[model samples]
Target: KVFERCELARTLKRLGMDGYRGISLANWMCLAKWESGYNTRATNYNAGDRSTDYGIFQINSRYWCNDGKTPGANNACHLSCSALLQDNIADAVACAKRVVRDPQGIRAWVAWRNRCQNRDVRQYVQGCGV
Candidate 1:
């Protein structure tokens, strides 16, 4: 799904992304905006590592989900990379939650560091009733 801003904000809240593992809903929104532009079927292949990032969060195959192709993939999330591409975000959200449980938290996403961290991120959810 290519979500409208407010629609994604509300959905993420209902999914318990708000303040999950000390990350805010707006930050999650910002990550999604920059990472996948709110598209559910997004996929990015890293030629350097022969791995793929999938879905709204752009979770990687190198250390997270497994695609049975990435070299040295650990499959930390116990998920197939294909599962992350579904239009329903429930599986994505669950994996996202598991991701932040690590010490790096949301920093697992480099896009968040370069774009969302220390930036004014509240605008991501502004007037979204989240």
Candidate 2:
């Protein structure tokens, strides 16, 4: 599922992400844009480690998701990697909350660190009317 920017914002807000889970909605929105362009089916494979990043949040196989094919996966979220590639994002949001609670916080997302950190991301939701 590919979300329009406004739709993504509205959905995130409805999920209590506007300011919940110690993460700003703008930060997650910005990270999503860079990570998956809001495509729920997005998947990235890291050849070096044979790990895969799944869905809009790019939850990793190494720690958060189980690909079934990957050995020694932590599966911290207790979910299959395929579960993230769906139009419904409730599970994705839940897992993301866990990621944010980790020591890295939202910095767990490299895209957020490089593109959204220490920035005025108010612009991301500026005209979305969220």
Candidate 3:
């Protein structure tokens, strides 16, 4: 599902994304914006590692989830890569939470570093009523 800005903000908040591991909802929104453009079914293949990033948060197969194709992949989320692509994002949200449980937190997403870090990320959730 391609979510509207406010719609996604509220949904992420409802899923407890706000301030998870010291990261704000707006930061999450900003990360998702740059990573996948709010498209749940988005996928990007990285030929270098022979892995693919999948779903809304663009979780990678090399480290987050198993796709049966990524060499030496680790399924930290313990879910199939396809799970992240579902419209019902409960699983995806949970996996994303697991990712930030590590020391890197939201830095797990390079897009967040490149675009959201030290920026006015508040714009992402401004009209969400979150």
Candidate 4:
């Protein structure tokens, strides 16, 4: 679980989203509560489906476990390899930082509390005031 939180914080930091901003320790705890309940091994079962969800972030194995070995590819292949290389917190942070630099990524995070007039997620993420 420490790894996951570290990955999250490091990722946010790489994105220039300062931890001193609104994204503080308390904020991370809240996110962890809603995301994985602080369980690195947490999993979720698909509704009315047999597909198994896994990982700290509940990222589905079928979707995120891309070692470039799986026969059928998942969204992670198309998304970011950071989640795939879950063992490497640095890589995961880089990937997440890239996402937060994008307008769409910032928008999604800010969607949780849309008070920004800017459209850029990067700026919003970095400029957020605690």
Residue 46's C-alpha lDDT in candidate 1?
Answer: 89
Best by TM-score: 3
How would you encode candidate 1's per-residue C-alpha lDDT over 1-130 as one tens digit per residue? 8989999999999999999988999999999999999999999988988998999999999888989999877988898888899989998999999899999999989999999999999889999997
Ranking by TM-score: 3, 1, 2, 4
Q: How close is candidate 2 to the true structure, as a TM-score?
A: 0.95
lDDT of each: 0.92, 0.88, 0.93, 0.42
> Per-residue lDDT for 1-130 in model 3, tens only?
9988999999999999999888899999998899999999999999887999999999999998889999988999999999999987889999999999999999989999999998998888886799
lDDT of 4 at 4: 42
lDDT of 2 by residue, 79-127 (tens): 8888899899988988888788788888898888898899888888879
Candidate 2 overall Cα lDDT vs. reference?
Answer: 0.88
lDDT of 4: 0.42
Candidate 4, after superposition: displacement of residue 41 in Å? 1.5
Candidate 3 — worst ten consecutive residues by lDDT sum?
121-130
When 1 and 2 are scored with TM-score, the better candidate is 1
Q: Model 4, range 4-26, lDDT digits (tens) per residue?
A: 44455555455454653234433
Shift in Å, residue 120, candidate 3: 0.4
Error of 4 at 126 (Å): 18
After superposition on all CA atoms, what RMSD does each candidate show versus the true structure? 0.8, 1.0, 0.6, 7.9
